[PDB]
Amino acid sequence: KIGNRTITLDPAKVNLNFQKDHIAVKGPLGQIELKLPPNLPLKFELKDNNLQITRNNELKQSKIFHGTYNALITNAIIGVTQGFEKKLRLVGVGYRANVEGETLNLQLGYSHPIKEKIPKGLTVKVEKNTEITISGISKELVGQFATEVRKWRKPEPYKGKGVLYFDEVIVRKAGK
Amino acid sequence: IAKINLLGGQAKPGPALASVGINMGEFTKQFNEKTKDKQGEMIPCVITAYNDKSFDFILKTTPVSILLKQAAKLEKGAKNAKTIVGKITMAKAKEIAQYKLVDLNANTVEAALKMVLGTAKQMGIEVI
Amino acid sequence: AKKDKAQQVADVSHLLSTSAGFVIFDYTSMSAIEATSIRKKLFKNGSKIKVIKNNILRRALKAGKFEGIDETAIKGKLAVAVGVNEIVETLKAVDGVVKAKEAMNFVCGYFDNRAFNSADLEKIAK
Amino acid sequence: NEFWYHHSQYIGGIKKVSGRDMLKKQSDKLVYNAVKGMLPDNRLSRRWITKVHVFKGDKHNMEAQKPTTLNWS
Amino acid sequence: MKVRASVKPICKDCKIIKRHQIVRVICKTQKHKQRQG
Amino acid sequence: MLQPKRTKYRKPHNVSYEGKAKGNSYVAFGEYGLVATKGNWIDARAIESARIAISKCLGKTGKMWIRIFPHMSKTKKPLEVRMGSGKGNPEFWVAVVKQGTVMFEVANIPESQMIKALTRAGHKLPVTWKILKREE
RNA sequence: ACCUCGAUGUCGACUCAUCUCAUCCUCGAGCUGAAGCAGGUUCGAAGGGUUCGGCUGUUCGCCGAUUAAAGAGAUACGUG
RNA sequence: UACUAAGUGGAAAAGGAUGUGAAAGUGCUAAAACAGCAAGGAUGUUGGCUUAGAAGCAGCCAUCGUUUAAAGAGUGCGUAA
């Protein structure tokens, strides 16, 4: 159970305050908010450069929230002290990705390219025209950007023509 | 790294040999020279890569379960333990074991014989 | 098991006390071809090779009348190639597997019951 | 679960409203109909229901009528 | 997507979840993603 | 199908059944057995369907024994027919199965596969499968 | 053989169309044994639309001729 | 007093789902055990029906021994092998 795990606390600027319905984690990269449910399924304490938030009650969703919130505390601390990073694989013969300012343009199977804006804090870079690297603060916003990009046209399952998460797979079958 | 099985002469099987980074003939002649004493018997050596590939390779002893037939005094091929591949003699079994000993993980003759018995079970006989 | 812990601690304590001339060399990512090579050279010797529990080994060496409670403790995947019987051929095999290793370190041990670190053990273990 | 469903003598525009959509347009008829759901069809039914002055704010237009300031009535 | 009355592992990795009170089997491969279990 | 050579009566009534233990208490010759949780007037069509399903999921390495038979006769009534004029056409043979009868016994295949076969037969049945063991 | 024979007007059509959406389309995506240009399934979807005639008399049933679409049914097998 | 996240009560059935609280045995374990985490994942391994390239998994067979705590002709993914 991840719920009890010695998550390290960063003394540079990261500090965690746990409200009766929320957690705020402040650090070099803005601040991360963990919106707790109205009830408290965890006992919230922060030891000197450590954190092990056990479950103060056992229930259907109490333990599930305990685990998910310890995991999100880990993610929040590490992404507020250094930030996270997602990757999109715009794979295709004529599929080309580029960044201007803080806007990402994609050339998919259409001859009319698409463009999309990225939420602030999440900075986007293109090292290869088939690669997009989004280094941000919280994984929630970068994943929100990724899911708003993907759900329009998924990559072809035979040979990659689209945006790959790098955590999603496809299956090849008949047809050339 | 790529694993191959050549004969005493021809090195046709697999383009894995060409992946070591050398002209085919320039190393085929070396293999024929170092495997001259083993001509006519297949040997499954292991390849090791090099820039010019002057000499980087390892001689892995002729494979039991096709070497087993040599001790069994025939050349019958089989894929199932149900069919019996002749009868294996003890002297040539021990010769195979000590000859396969360097190929084996162990350096003891008893373990070599045990491994030979284990792998020879494929063709339909254990070492006896 | 807890009983397994106690039994292993006892046996390892006895083997490290009687045979104080040992080498608990450890390779994280203990490999199969490396074990192959070391036991090929080792065969004709009583020594073996294994990946052992760090807690039982550390408590045993604590009770084995030998130096070290953290020098025989947590470090990645703890492998052991204890020096048993003659530690001469055993140390030849240990040096051979260190050569086969990308990076193998002298964790703890004495050659012939005398203090011998990486600068001095391998001088005679060669 | 609890949406709000209505169908008058009109047909073709059967009104189905979610809880969040109710907060966007109208809220007085909610409690109006909820209270009138406990009123038998009689002469003063729709006359009894007007005594339930439904408001979305703390004030009311009848403050000049000497209202009794209390709670949970 | 689909419609059934029971969901079981279909492919090699076909995890069983309870999504919107509907028991489903979803595979890492998009093929084996049923509903209404 | 399970067609009797003859019957004690041409059209026995839809006779009422009483009793929670009568007929084939356990599996006489098999290892596992299917019990129906619906004591009623059953037909041999579903019996044969369950048997062929069990054989399909077992191949032939597992052995199947039936132990009941549709002795009496029961009717199903079509449309555009006025009630009366005697008992209706005896559409099918029928067994009056009381609760506690072993009709199907399976053997010679692993126990989990036997349970799966009984579940299969139950899904080819209006009744719910129950797993029973041998007591001889 | 029941509310209905000291009656309860029905076949079909024209018109009026409405409605539930187990969808034809549009709108939307998934799954796709979807190579692309287009999409097979699925559901969401009543919100709208969702053929003319010769011929059995007639929409419908044969045939000719139409769009993305020329709907699964009830309204006393709608209507008087 | 719980139980719920469905408004079940105030629709189910053939059946499925770690649903949950609770109940019931369970080994490790506070010397940190199991699954992510360090991992080896080898050898005969090219063994054969056999293919310039199926020989370690298009597919099949003996799938067993050896180094060993441990490695399966590989559980699988994957290379034309």
Resolution in A, one decimal? 16.0
Spell out the domains of chain B, with CATH numbers in brackets. 2-59 (3.30.1550.10), 66-127 (1.10.10.250)
Is residue C114 helix, strand or coil?
Answer: strand
Taking a C-beta distance cutoff of 8 angstroms, is the pair A87, A59 a contact? no
Chain H bases near protein Cβ (<7 Å): 3-7, 13-22, 27-32, 38-55, 60-71, 73, 76-77, 80-81
The 8-class DSSP code of residue D50 comes to G
Taking a C-beta distance cutoff of 8 angstroms, is the pair A58, A47 a contact? no
In chain A, which residue's Cα lies nearest the Cα of E32? A171
Taking a C-beta distance cutoff of 8 angstroms, is the pair A44, A23 a contact? yes
Is residue C37 helix, strand or coil?
Answer: helix
Neighbours of F135 (CB within 10 A): 7
Taking a C-beta distance cutoff of 8 angstroms, is the pair A22, A36 a contact? yes
Cβ partners under 8 Å of residue B42, min gap 6? B5, B6, B7, B8, B62, B63, B66
Alpha carbons D2 and C105: distance in angstroms, whole number: 69
Q: Report yes or no on chains C and A touching (3+ CB pairs under 8 A).
A: no
The 8-class DSSP code of residue A63 comes to H
Nearest-neighbour CA in chain B from C37: distance (Å): 7
Task: Annotate B12-69 with DSSP letters as a single string.
Answer: -S-TTGGGGSS-HHHHHHHHHHHTGGGTTS-B--EE---SS-SS-EE-----TTTSHH
Single out the residue of F17, F2, F34 nearest to residue F102, CA to CA: F34
Chain A and chain E share a number of CB contacts under 8 A equal to 9
Single out the residue of A29, A6, A47 nearest to residue A123, CA to CA: A29
Per-residue burial over A6-36, b if 16 or more Cβ lie within 10 Å, else e, is ebebbeeebebebeeeebebebebbebebeb
Q: Cα–Cα–Cα angle for A122, A127, A132, nearest 5°?
A: 45
Which DSSP helix (H) or strand (E) runs through A18?
strand A15-18
Specify the pairing of strand A15-18 against strand A96-100.
unpaired
Torsion, Cα A53 A57 A58 A64, to 10 degrees, reads: -40
Alpha carbons C7 and A132: distance in angstroms, whole number: 56
**Residue F56: exposed, middle, or buried by beta-carbon count in 10 A (0-12, 13-18, 19+)?**
exposed
Within this chain, domains A15-82 and A84-165 share the same CATH topology: yes
Chain G bases near protein Cβ (<7 Å): 1, 18-20, 29-37, 42-43, 46-48
Residue B106, chain C, CB below 8 Å: the answer is yes
Q: Do C43 and B107 touch (CB under 8 A)?
A: yes
Alpha carbons E4 and E24: distance in angstroms, whole number: 9
Architecture of the domain whose range is A15-82: Alpha-Beta Complex (3.90)
Q: Which residue is nearest to nucleotide H35 (CA to C1')?
A: A1
Q: What phi and psi values does residue F20 have, to the nearest 5 degrees?
A: -100, 0
Q: Do B108 and C39 touch (CB under 8 A)?
A: no
Per-residue burial over A135-159, b if 16 or more Cβ lie within 10 Å, else e, is bbbbbbbbeebbeebbeeeebebee
Taking a C-beta distance cutoff of 8 angstroms, is the pair A46, A9 a contact? yes
Side-chain-facing half-sphere of C122: CA atoms under 13 Å: 13
* C6 sits within 7 Å of strand H by its CB: yes
E strand segments, F27-133? 32-36, 41-42, 63-66, 72-74, 92-96, 102-107, 129-133
Q: How many residues are listed for chain A in this entry?
A: 176
Task: Annotate A81-114 with DSSP letters as a single string.
Answer: HT--EEEEEEESSS-EEEEETTEEEEE-SSSS-E
Q: Do B105 and C43 touch (CB under 8 A)?
A: no
Instruction: Kindly report each contact of residues A66-69 with a partner whose C-beta sits within 8 Å and lies 24 or more positions away, as own/partner.
Output: A66/A1, A66/A3, A66/A41, A66/A42, A67/A1, A67/A2, A67/A3, A69/A3, A69/A23, A69/A34, A69/A36, A69/A41, A69/A42
Q: What phi and psi values does residue C67 have, to the nearest 5 degrees?
A: -70, 125
- The full set of domain ranges for chain A reads 15-82, 84-165
CB < 7 Å to strand H — which of 44-83 in chain C? Answer: 48-51, 55-56, 58-59, 74, 76-77, 79
Alpha carbons F40 and F14: distance in angstroms, whole number: 10
Q: Report yes or no on chains B and A touching (3+ CB pairs under 8 A).
A: no
Chain B residues within an 8 Å CB radius of C39? 105-107
* B111 sits within 7 Å of strand H by its CB: yes
CA of E16 to C1' of H20 (A): 17
Alpha carbons B90 and F91: distance in angstroms, whole number: 77
Alpha carbons D2 and B126: distance in angstroms, whole number: 77
Single out the residue of C71, C106, C112 nearest to residue C89, CA to CA: C112
Three-state secondary structure string covering E1-37: CCCCCCCCCCCCCEEEEEECCEEEEEECCCCCECCCC
The 8-class DSSP code of residue A67 comes to H
Taking a C-beta distance cutoff of 8 angstroms, is the pair C47, C111 a contact? no
Distances (CA, A) of A131 to A88, A124, C58, F28: 6, 10, 49, 70
* E20 sits within 7 Å of strand G by its CB: no
Q: Which candidate in A150, A156, A170, A171 is best for mutational testing of the E interface (most E CBs within 10 A)?
A: A171
Q: How many residues are listed for chain F in this entry?
A: 136
Alpha carbons A86 and A98: distance in angstroms, whole number: 16
Is residue A73 helix, strand or coil?
Answer: helix
Nearest-neighbour CA in chain E from A168: distance (Å): 7
Name the interface residues of E facing A (CB cutoff 8 Å).
28-31
Alpha carbons C71 and A151: distance in angstroms, whole number: 54
Which method was it determined by? cryo-EM
Per-residue burial over F70-108, b if 16 or more Cβ lie within 10 Å, else e, is bebbbeeeeeeeeeeeeeeebebbbbbbeebbbbbbbbe
E27 closest-nt by C1' vs CA: G31
Residue C47, chain B, CB below 8 Å: the answer is no
Chain A residues within an 8 Å CB radius of E29? 169-171
> Which CATH number is associated with domain A84-165?
3.90.930.12
Q: Cα D21 to the chain's mean position, in Å?
A: 16
| Cα dihedral across residues F14, F15, F17, F23: positive or negative | negative
- Contact partners for chain D, using 3 or more CB pairs closer than 8 A, are none
Look at the block and give the residue holding tokens 């792998």. B119
B45 closest-nt by C1' vs CA: H46
- The full set of domain ranges for chain C reads 1-125
Chain A residues within an 8 Å CB radius of E26? none
